[PDB]
């Protein structure tokens, strides 16, 4: 099986090809939002605790929230909802999914960390991806920094230097 684990503060993410079939039998019959023990799955993950975010089973059909079963279903989905993007306004659509219970049918299980255990993880905690963008709005910058109502966000602006050739500029 695979565990697509993520650490959201570091913004990091990695897949882990898991075996120890019984240390994933623990994951069996589990819902979304629930948090089980890193040590229980793996002493390499000793002390850690994750949260079962979701996952794709075979045939790539994701895990959807709220349905409360492991078996697959055909839902007449609509906008503002996971597992369907509408290619037109108004289009509802019947699509197949898998539900919010964990079992062998799954192939990749998506996890998020809420607490960092005692040891350190190679591709999640030792690393941290930066914030790709800076806040583009005045007050968002202003409150992000904690300056004032008048501290000139215009000069607190972000400047991201890049070189076209040798001419360089922050754009």
């Amino acid at each position: 099986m695979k565990l697509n684990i993520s650490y959201p503060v570091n913004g990091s993410q990695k897949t882990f090809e898991i075996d120890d079939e019984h240390r994933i039998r623990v994951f069996f019959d589990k819902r979304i939002g629930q948090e089980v023990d890193g040590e229980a799955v793996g002493d390499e993950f000793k002390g850690y605790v994750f949260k079962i975010s979701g996952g794709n089973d075979k045939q790539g059909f994701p895990m959807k929230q709220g349905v409360l079963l492991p078996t697959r279903i055909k839902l007449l989905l609509t906008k503002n909802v996971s597992c369907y993007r509408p290619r037109r306004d108004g289009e509802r659509k019947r699509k197949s999914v898998r539900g919010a219970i964990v079992g062998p049918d799954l192939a990749v299980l998506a996890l998020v960390i809420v607490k960092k255990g005692e040891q350190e993880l190679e591709g999640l905690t030792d690393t941290t991806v930066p914030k790709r963008l800076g806040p583009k709005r005045a007050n968002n910058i202003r409150k992000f920094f904690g300056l004032s109502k008048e501290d000139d966000v215009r000069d607190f602006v972000i400047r991201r230097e890049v070189t076209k050739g040798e001419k360089t500029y922050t754009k």
Binding site: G146, I158, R160, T170
Partner: protein, 126 residues
């Protein structure tokens, strides 16, 4: 192996124990026992049958599953820079914000500038 759930009673069906039914519409039902099977053939409603899990959960009996939703009593705790602002100098200028005579003097400069602007504009208009 796996264990499953009676359509009617909603009970674990250990392997072999029990019957299975496949309606013409390809709906696969499972029954732990001929009791459930016979009721199903009678077209009964388990939500009305009392000993069933559906009635149990519809009348809210044995409700030890749900507890509450947790809440954190704090903030995000990141007054960080925006990757192009040098957070040290950012906090330094945030602290220089009070005692605002600097921005006030810049305003006074641009203010006398607007004075002279209207003056010279009227001069050019004349």
């Amino acid at each position: 192996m796996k264990v499953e759930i009676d359509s009617f009673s909603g009970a674990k069906i250990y392997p072999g124990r029990g019957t299975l039914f496949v309606r013409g519409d390809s709906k696969i039902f499972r029954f732990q026992n001929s009791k459930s099977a016979s009721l199903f053939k009678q077209r009964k409603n388990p939500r009305r049958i009392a000993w069933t899990v559906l009635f149990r959960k519809h009348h809210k009996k044995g409700i030890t599953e749900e507890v509450a939703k947790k809440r954190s009593r704090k903030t995000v705790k990141a007054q960080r820079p925006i990757t192009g602002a040098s957070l040290d100098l950012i906090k330094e200028r945030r602290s220089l914000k009070p005692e605002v005579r600097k921005a006030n003097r810049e305003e006074k400069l641009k203010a006398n500038k607007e004075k002279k602007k209207a003056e010279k504009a009227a001069r050019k208009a004349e």
